[PDB]
Write a protein that holds these residues in place. Sequence first.
Motif, PDB file in Angstrom:
ATOM      1  N   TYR A  64      -1.372  13.364  -0.459  1.00 24.15           N
ATOM      2  CA  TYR A  64      -1.964  13.829   0.230  1.00 24.15           C
ATOM      3  C   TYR A  64      -3.661  12.742  -0.275  1.00 24.15           C
ATOM      4  CZ  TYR A  64      -0.184  17.611   3.516  1.00 24.15           C
ATOM      5  OH  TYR A  64       0.135  17.982   4.825  1.00 24.15           O
ATOM      6  N   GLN A  65      -3.836  13.271  -1.084  1.00 22.07           N
ATOM      7  CA  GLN A  65      -4.753  12.502  -2.345  1.00 22.07           C
ATOM      8  C   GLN A  65      -4.810  10.753  -2.257  1.00 22.07           C
ATOM      9  OE1 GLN A  65      -4.516  13.621  -6.589  1.00 22.07           O
ATOM     10  NE2 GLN A  65      -6.671  12.717  -6.726  1.00 22.07           N
ATOM     11  N   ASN A  66      -3.142  10.318  -2.185  1.00 24.90           N
ATOM     12  CA  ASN A  66      -3.639   9.307  -1.767  1.00 24.90           C
ATOM     13  C   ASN A  66      -4.507   9.408  -0.339  1.00 24.90           C
ATOM     14  OD1 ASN A  66      -2.416   8.028  -3.894  1.00 24.90           O
ATOM     15  ND2 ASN A  66      -0.997   8.759  -3.811  1.00 24.90           N
TER      16      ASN A  66
ATOM     17  N   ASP B 233       0.480  -0.707  -0.218  1.00 27.95           N
ATOM     18  CA  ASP B 233       0.253  -0.248  -0.066  1.00 27.95           C
ATOM     19  C   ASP B 233       0.931   1.674   0.051  1.00 27.95           C
ATOM     20  OD1 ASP B 233      -1.758  -1.682  -0.116  1.00 27.95           O
ATOM     21  OD2 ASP B 233      -3.236  -0.575   2.231  1.00 27.95           O
TER      22      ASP B 233
ATOM     23  N   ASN C  24       0.507  20.359   6.732  1.00 25.25           N
ATOM     24  CA  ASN C  24       0.555  19.755   7.666  1.00 25.25           C
ATOM     25  C   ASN C  24       0.380  19.540   8.772  1.00 25.25           C
ATOM     26  OD1 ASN C  24       2.055  17.716   5.429  1.00 25.25           O
ATOM     27  ND2 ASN C  24       4.424  18.953   5.999  1.00 25.25           N
TER      28      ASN C  24
ATOM     29  N   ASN D  57      10.098  11.924  13.910  1.00 23.26           N
ATOM     30  CA  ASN D  57       9.311  10.664  12.678  1.00 23.26           C
ATOM     31  C   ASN D  57       8.628  11.975  13.060  1.00 23.26           C
ATOM     32  OD1 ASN D  57       9.130   9.151  10.913  1.00 23.26           O
ATOM     33  ND2 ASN D  57       7.214   8.229  12.306  1.00 23.26           N
TER      34      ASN D  57
ATOM     35  N   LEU E  74      -3.755   1.253  -6.296  1.00 27.46           N
ATOM     36  CA  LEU E  74      -2.656   0.837  -5.867  1.00 27.46           C
ATOM     37  C   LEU E  74      -1.602   1.027  -6.783  1.00 27.46           C
ATOM     38  CD1 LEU E  74      -3.426  -2.689  -4.007  1.00 27.46           C
ATOM     39  CD2 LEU E  74      -2.568  -0.336  -2.670  1.00 27.46           C
TER      40      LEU E  74
ATOM     41  N   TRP F 168       5.174  22.185  13.937  1.00 26.10           N
ATOM     42  CA  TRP F 168       5.298  21.958  12.775  1.00 26.10           C
ATOM     43  C   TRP F 168       5.171  23.319  12.147  1.00 26.10           C
ATOM     44  CZ3 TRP F 168       6.813  20.370   7.698  1.00 26.10           C
ATOM     45  CH2 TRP F 168       7.334  19.062   7.969  1.00 26.10           C
TER      46      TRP F 168
ATOM     47  N   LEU G  29      -0.434   3.969  -7.087  1.00 25.58           N
ATOM     48  CA  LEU G  29       1.375   4.187  -6.418  1.00 25.58           C
ATOM     49  C   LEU G  29       1.929   4.417  -6.695  1.00 25.58           C
ATOM     50  CD1 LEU G  29      -0.924   2.856  -2.895  1.00 25.58           C
ATOM     51  CD2 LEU G  29      -1.255   5.432  -4.015  1.00 25.58           C
TER      52      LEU G  29
ATOM     53  N   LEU H  86       5.641  14.002   3.858  1.00 26.72           N
ATOM     54  CA  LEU H  86       5.941  14.866   4.767  1.00 26.72           C
ATOM     55  C   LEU H  86       8.034  15.222   5.001  1.00 26.72           C
ATOM     56  CD1 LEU H  86       5.908  14.522   8.249  1.00 26.72           C
ATOM     57  CD2 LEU H  86       4.133  15.864   7.194  1.00 26.72           C
TER      58      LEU H  86
ATOM     59  N   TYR I  15      -6.569   7.662 -11.069  1.00 27.25           N
ATOM     60  CA  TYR I  15      -7.480   7.907  -9.873  1.00 27.25           C
ATOM     61  C   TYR I  15      -9.109   8.134 -10.671  1.00 27.25           C
ATOM     62  CZ  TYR I  15      -5.001   8.410  -6.092  1.00 27.25           C
ATOM     63  OH  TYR I  15      -4.402   9.011  -4.453  1.00 27.25           O
TER      64      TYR I  15
ATOM     65  N   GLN J  69      -1.844   7.781   7.195  1.00 25.34           N
ATOM     66  CA  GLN J  69      -0.637   8.056   7.740  1.00 25.34           C
ATOM     67  C   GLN J  69       0.229   8.000   7.506  1.00 25.34           C
ATOM     68  OE1 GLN J  69      -1.244  10.207  10.269  1.00 25.34           O
ATOM     69  NE2 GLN J  69      -0.185   9.148  12.112  1.00 25.34           N
TER      70      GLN J  69
ATOM     71  N   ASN K  66       7.529   5.432  -8.724  1.00 24.34           N
ATOM     72  CA  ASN K  66       9.132   4.602  -9.190  1.00 24.34           C
ATOM     73  C   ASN K  66       9.189   4.649 -10.701  1.00 24.34           C
ATOM     74  OD1 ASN K  66       8.063   2.930  -6.590  1.00 24.34           O
ATOM     75  ND2 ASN K  66      10.364   4.322  -6.517  1.00 24.34           N
TER      76      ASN K  66
ATOM     77  N   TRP L  54       1.342   7.942   4.634  1.00 18.12           N
ATOM     78  CA  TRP L  54       1.146   8.427   2.952  1.00 18.12           C
ATOM     79  C   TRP L  54       1.842   9.744   3.896  1.00 18.12           C
ATOM     80  CZ3 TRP L  54       2.346   8.262  -1.736  1.00 18.12           C
ATOM     81  CH2 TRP L  54       2.617   7.099  -2.424  1.00 18.12           C
ATOM     82  N   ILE L  55       0.594  10.806   4.330  1.00 14.75           N
ATOM     83  CA  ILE L  55       1.589  11.661   4.823  1.00 14.75           C
ATOM     84  C   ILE L  55       2.762  11.510   5.501  1.00 14.75           C
ATOM     85  CG2 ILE L  55       0.237  13.383   6.741  1.00 14.75           C
ATOM     86  CD1 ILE L  55      -2.015  11.990   6.876  1.00 14.75           C
ATOM     87  N   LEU L  56       3.358  10.774   6.367  1.00 12.66           N
ATOM     88  CA  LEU L  56       4.199  10.764   6.811  1.00 12.66           C
ATOM     89  C   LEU L  56       5.666  10.852   6.142  1.00 12.66           C
ATOM     90  CD1 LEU L  56       4.000   8.591   9.636  1.00 12.66           C
ATOM     91  CD2 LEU L  56       4.273  10.584   9.895  1.00 12.66           C
TER      92      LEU L  56
ATOM     93  N   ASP M  69       5.086   2.863  -0.411  1.00 14.28           N
ATOM     94  CA  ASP M  69       6.841   2.230  -1.590  1.00 14.28           C
ATOM     95  C   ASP M  69       7.216   1.700  -0.640  1.00 14.28           C
ATOM     96  OD1 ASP M  69       5.569   3.820  -3.499  1.00 14.28           O
ATOM     97  OD2 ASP M  69       7.485   5.178  -4.039  1.00 14.28           O
TER      98      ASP M  69
ATOM     99  N   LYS N  74      -3.162  19.035   9.159  1.00 17.94           N
ATOM    100  CA  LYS N  74      -3.566  17.828   9.039  1.00 17.94           C
ATOM    101  C   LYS N  74      -3.282  16.867  10.298  1.00 17.94           C
ATOM    102  CE  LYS N  74      -5.390  16.015   4.887  1.00 17.94           C
ATOM    103  NZ  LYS N  74      -6.178  15.330   4.855  1.00 17.94           N
TER     104      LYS N  74
ATOM    105  N   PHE O 139      -7.551   6.168   1.343  1.00 20.07           N
ATOM    106  CA  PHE O 139      -7.015   5.503   2.060  1.00 20.07           C
ATOM    107  C   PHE O 139      -7.847   5.855   3.296  1.00 20.07           C
ATOM    108  CE2 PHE O 139      -2.712   4.121   0.198  1.00 20.07           C
ATOM    109  CZ  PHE O 139      -2.903   2.867  -0.310  1.00 20.07           C
TER     110      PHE O 139
ATOM    111  N   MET P 102      -6.115  14.763  12.761  1.00 21.37           N
ATOM    112  CA  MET P 102      -6.082  13.857  13.709  1.00 21.37           C
ATOM    113  C   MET P 102      -6.510  13.626  15.174  1.00 21.37           C
ATOM    114  SD  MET P 102      -3.174  11.342  12.191  1.00 21.37           S
ATOM    115  CE  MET P 102      -3.513  11.452  10.727  1.00 21.37           C
TER     116      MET P 102
END
Lengths: 103, 103, 103, 103, 103, 103, 103, 103, 124, 124
Positions: free
Chosen positions: A75-77, A9, B77, B8, D40, B38, D43, A43, D75, A36, D47, A38-40, A11, B80, A81, B84
């Motif tokens: 963010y769209q991903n 889900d 960010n 992180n 998926l 942030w 995503l 960043l 999408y 979560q 790459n 994907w947001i990270l 990389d 977001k 999710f 959360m």
Amino acid sequence: EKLRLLLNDKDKKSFTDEELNLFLEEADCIYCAASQGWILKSLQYENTVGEMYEYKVGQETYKSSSIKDLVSVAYQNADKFKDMCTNKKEKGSFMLGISTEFE
Amino acid sequence: EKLRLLLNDKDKKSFTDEELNLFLEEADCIYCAASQGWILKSLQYENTVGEMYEYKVGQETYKSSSIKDLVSVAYQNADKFKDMCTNKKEKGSFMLGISTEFE
Amino acid sequence: EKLRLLLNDKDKKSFTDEELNLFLEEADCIYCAASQGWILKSLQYENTVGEMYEYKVGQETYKSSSIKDLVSVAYQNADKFKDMCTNKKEKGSFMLGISTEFE
Amino acid sequence: EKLRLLLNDKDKKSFTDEELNLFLEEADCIYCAASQGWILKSLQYENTVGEMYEYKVGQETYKSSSIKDLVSVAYQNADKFKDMCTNKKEKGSFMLGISTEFE
Amino acid sequence: EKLRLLLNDKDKKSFTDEELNLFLEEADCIYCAASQGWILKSLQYENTVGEMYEYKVGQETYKSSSIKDLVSVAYQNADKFKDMCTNKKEKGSFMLGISTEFE
Amino acid sequence: EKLRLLLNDKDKKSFTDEELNLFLEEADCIYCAASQGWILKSLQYENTVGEMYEYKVGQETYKSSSIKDLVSVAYQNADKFKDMCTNKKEKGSFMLGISTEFE
Amino acid sequence: EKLRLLLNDKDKKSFTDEELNLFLEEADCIYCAASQGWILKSLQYENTVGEMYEYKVGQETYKSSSIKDLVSVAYQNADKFKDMCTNKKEKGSFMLGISTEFE
Amino acid sequence: EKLRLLLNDKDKKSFTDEELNLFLEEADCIYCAASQGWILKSLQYENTVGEMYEYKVGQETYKSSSIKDLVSVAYQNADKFKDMCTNKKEKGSFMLGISTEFE
Amino acid sequence: INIDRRRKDIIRTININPTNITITSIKKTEIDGAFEETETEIKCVVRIFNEKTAEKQISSEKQGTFSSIRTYGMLVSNDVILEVNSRDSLEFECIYGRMKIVNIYPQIVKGELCGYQCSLERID
Amino acid sequence: INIDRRRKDIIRTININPTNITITSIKKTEIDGAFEETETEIKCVVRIFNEKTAEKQISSEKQGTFSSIRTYGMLVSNDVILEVNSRDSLEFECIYGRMKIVNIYPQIVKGELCGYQCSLERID
């Protein structure tokens, strides 16, 4: 396996192994963890594309999408999710009986 | 560990650990502290990248992301993480009984 | 220490410490003082960027974000600090009893 | 064969069958699995194409589609398959009789 | 000192202190005088910067901020100080008793 | 003949006749199958144009419409075929009698 | 001195003192006179900048803000002065008693 | 002759004359068949004009209309013929008598 | 522009496509009205790029034959101080003919060196 | 930029308009202070394109006459290693006069070859 499905889900080898377990612990539903993560991951773009996204040296020219577009995609991903998780746990409307005791 | 997870969330090696401890002490919810960090990291882009978003010297040409885009992404960010925090702390609606003594 | 935290919030080494003390005196909440300091910092962009924000000499070219952009970013910082202060001092709605004396 | 049809709904050899069967098992409707697989696969543009959407080397110049455009189109395809799944499973309105026992 | 704080609010070395005293006298609230001084300082951009926002001579090329942007930013600063003056002098709502004499 | 008519509707010689038969089996109405085939055909623009849509070598320059425009055109074809099918199966409003048995 | 205050509210060097006295006596409130004088000053741009606002000779290039932008700025000054005059003469709402004679 | 008028409605040899008979048969109203045929003709632009809307070779440069524009114009023509069909077949409002037998 | 910005940009650009290079420097020293050449060898990380659409010149004569082209530039960090004069030369062994550093452009910010923009000549 | 991106782009661009070409290489080898020439023939898939708006030079003299033009470029994949020097030549016969490879630009990504940008001279 939940870890392998999550690394599908997202990389596969940008994140270390332990933080995947951390995200799996934080949310039981895998798609919330994927959002979560994907947001990270989103960043990260300040390091690479933030400081330089378009450069030309000599006749060599290279252009890459700005940080705003890439973080927008991430963010769209994340939102997809999250909505997937909601639809997973969502349930339709209900009509139920009601009754109070009386003598 | 709180500090590792925060480093992180709020990207590492921009603050020293004492202000991170202060961030954790400000709010028990880690995501609220992440949003605060942030924002306070967003304030630092004026030094790390500066307003000089593009320059050409000799045959070198470099176009960095403008400070507006970087601060906007940092704010997004932070928003977001704030959302959360709210969703983690938010509880749904409620219908409860009511009763007053009489005679 | 309040002055250290304010110098963290309001970006450092632009205002000497006496006006920082004045800011701390003007308002108890540090975030209101941070918003005030951010606006007063945003005033400075006249000299730095109003006079010149994009110049080229020879093959040397340099571009910087216009004064409107930077003052917009600083205003965004000020408004975020102000909203942070309001949320800190905000309290939820209330239902309270009422009673008037009677014979 | 369901797997072959899914490999037509979603283009070949971006995945391996070990997850195509998983997507088929995830939802009985093939179009829902196609939408999931399309997200998926969207995503994977991080790459297979990368953010470097345009570059010039020597006399070569190439302008590939930006990653935002590709993920947007993926999408859109996923949304089309999801809508197809709903319309396949959707049933029209109904007016039915109601009755309660009484003496 | 009121004059020093006003000079901080409205930058130094442009106006002589006589008009600063005038602005202080015309409004007890310092921020109101700051807004007035900021408008009157905005008027001065027609001389200090002038209309010639960009010029190239020889290999020199300089692009200054246009006068419209500068006066707009000065007006925005004046508006911020005016809103500050209002909020400092603002008072929340009130519910009060009312009574008329009667025999 | 159904297959030849579909190959006329869905642009020819991009899908082998096996999946054409599959689409014919999938939907009773040929226009629904045509919309399906057009949506599936729109996926090829990924490979064809997504990775490169405008390139210049030497004095040779070649530009093609981006992937977004081509997929938009294919989607428009799909929607027109779908609306055509609906209008074919559409029937106007109706007023009918009603009668319940009674003693 | 009212003349010097008006000449501070205006940019000077383009109005001889006679019309300054004319504005002072036409409108008692100085800010109304300032607005009138600013509109009259704005009229002048048809000669200076209307005839020519951007020229290049040889390698010498000079650009100035168009007549529309400058007259817009002057109009903004005029409107601010007019609104300042209104707020000067503005007075809040009122509730007053009422009484009619009767026998 | 119906076929000649239809081949006037669509410029000659984008279709073999045989399938014009099919188009006429599928709808007695000639304009309906014209709209259907215009959509089917719109499908053919991917072969006749392709995606390569602009190219330069040597000193030659040619800028053909993009495929999106051509299909849009063909769709507009089809819509015009469809509206013509409706207006030809459309009839205005009606007020009619109603009567039920009774003793 | 700040020095750290320039340093980061130069190092990043070199690291997109670096090549390890063995610069050899022959410095001529005046001794009794003639040159005594001292050969030194220094290594640096370098990125090579096209800068000029030039044409390969040829210089055949009774001394010999060699063809050189001026197309390639060069971009190197601050790690080593370079200098090219009439009496000083710098060459290195690229696989496709020997390269030779023609002219050096030292990128300086506020009187401080940060990296050399440089030009080459691929001697075949 | 990734190596696979460059490889895909080069192969695609060649395949838009490829031509099969019979490169002939005459490499001069120093033997007793003179050249012994060994002739080899190698084949590659190639796309030819214009690069420069140049004029056809003519060089008539008592040795003979020939006219050449520098307009055409060339773009070839990684399939064969090329090299052109004073002592090394590469030619091939397009039907519109003999072609000759003047200069080679090796496209390299992270110290790895992926294809040669090239320039030609159509010798009439």
